[PDB]
Amino acid sequence: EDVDYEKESKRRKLEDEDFLKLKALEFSKDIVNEKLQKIIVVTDGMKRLYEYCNCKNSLETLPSAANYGSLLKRLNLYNLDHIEMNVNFYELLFPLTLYNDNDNSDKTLSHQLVNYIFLASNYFQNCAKNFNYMRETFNVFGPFKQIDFMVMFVIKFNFLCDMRNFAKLIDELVPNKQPNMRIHSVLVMRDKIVKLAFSNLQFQTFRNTKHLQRLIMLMNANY
Amino acid sequence: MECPFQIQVCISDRFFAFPHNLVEPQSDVGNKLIENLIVYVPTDDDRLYIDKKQFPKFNSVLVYRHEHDVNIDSRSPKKTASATIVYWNPLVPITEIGAGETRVFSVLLTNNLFYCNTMIVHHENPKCPIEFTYPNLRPIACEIPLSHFKELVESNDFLLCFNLETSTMVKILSLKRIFCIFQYRKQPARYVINLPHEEIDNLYNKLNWERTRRLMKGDVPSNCATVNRSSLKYIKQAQSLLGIPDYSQTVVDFVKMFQKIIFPYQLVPNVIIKLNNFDQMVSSAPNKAEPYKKIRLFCKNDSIAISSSGIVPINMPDFSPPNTFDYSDYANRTNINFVTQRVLTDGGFSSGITVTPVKYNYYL
């Protein structure tokens, strides 16, 4: 017999060495980000919606969209109020921060990421700046009960096409298990001012969904 | 205060990382398992490391920064068994509890946690780390743990900082975490800190209280700790007056060097005497002017001990009130004076001479 615990104490002593190795394995990069996987899945993951998005250059309004706006009139059948009027912004863009630029990179990418972030920020700032103008320029095609939601969708979709392109530039570079602290915080504060812009909007609002429902969920940060 | 009934504390330095494994779904009597779970953390930053996927046992998991309310403040917190609750390294008392016994897993015993059901699962880390100060360096952010993960594996020369607003509690917490991970590290890396540090010596005193608190239930580790300024400068002067082969030489070096010789002379080194002398508190203690803390020093198999004041017999109050007293027929003022006159005459010395007869404790 050996009733004393010291046997198990020694066993713990042994185990302890592993601790650091285990933790390091628990902090190494991760192979892929399922959020980006979901993006790639949904991108043209529903009937032919890619082909309408001829819009480009990330800084454009009513780029001959009226052709697509006709099909948005047809979409007007749906209760487009299911669309969120707010932009999830950070709550979608978080996965992009899971990249230590010191590795799997020339350390150059984060710069372009911040540039794209400020781009989209100014985009949405102009959207808030001119929404009513945009309302009228598309109301040209006829008022609709949910024209506000239609405009919101137009904005979000046109953004999303560029977002798809931008993501496919990175093309599933290996992410870290955790985001960059400073990039995350910068995103956080810029999202603060962005939601402040939504507050400054001060507007008020004016099933066979499953396909378009996929993109609606994705806009609404379904997970 | 005290911990409310039906709450338990588990200390583990390992809890510096979130122990995703251990927790199990609580259930009420009647096996009413509560897969709804909510967790509370010092900061939103803490959430960024913590993964929902680790807990298939639960269908519903949520996490929030703690905030110290007012209206619920009670010795007995509010109860809500409808959800399991966890607090991880909490700073401040909690006013609400989950299903069944609530449990907290934390590195650090706050005073709030004293009168509490507590377990530690402790283990000794043998490797004491060190500070160093030169006035190459690794700039370590003063708060974020894993920002420099594996850098703390690779290097040994760690610079530290803080932002002005920082809660002292947060400072202590981060420092504790760093020291634990260092004690796990295989070599004594060197601290460097860019702060006025007087408040850091204050916080060190806090750490002393904390370690004692632990030791109330603890592993009695031989944990290294030091006075950091008075001592520091003194030892620096000591080295300077000696030859300085290494201005970076650790104190423990000199300590052990004297250890080599103490027993053969059976008497107390002045270095160790000045230690436990010029600490504010753990010493002769200018905090309260307490030289009364004389050291009784013992060694294996001895029939006797070495006091601050000479040999003593074992387990007795340092000096007998009775003795072969210093009978005044010696130490007669008159005799002392005469001798002094003789001496001064011979020396041709005008000033600066004083003498005192010796005195004796238990033994002569």
Curated annotation (Swiss-Prot), chain A:
GO terms for biological process: exit of virus from host cell nucleus by nuclear egress. It is found in: Host nucleus; Virion. GO terms for cellular component: host cell nucleus; viral capsid; virion component. The keyword DNA-binding applies. Keywords: Capsid protein, DNA-binding, Host nucleus, Virion. Disulfide bonds: none annotated. GO terms for molecular function: DNA binding; protein homodimerization activity. Structural protein that plays a role in the packaging of nucleocapsids and in their egress from the nucleus toward the cell periphery. Homodimer. Interacts with host nuclear F-actin. This is Capsid-associated protein VP80. It comes from Autographa californica nuclear polyhedrosis virus (AcMNPV). The chain holds residues 460 to 688 of 691 of the full protein.
Curated annotation (Swiss-Prot), chain B:
It comes from the Viruses. It is found in: Host cytoplasm; Host nucleus. One of its GO terms (biological process) is transport of viral material towards nucleus. Keywords: Host cytoplasm, Host nucleus. Its main location: host cell. InterPro entries: AcMNPV_Orf109. GO terms for cellular component: host cell; host cell cytoplasm; host cell nucleus. Plays a role in the transport of the budded virion (BV) to the host nucleus and for occlusion of viral progeny. This is Protein AC109. The lineage of its organism: Viruses, Viruses incertae sedis, Naldaviricetes, Lefavirales, Baculoviridae. The gene is ORF109.
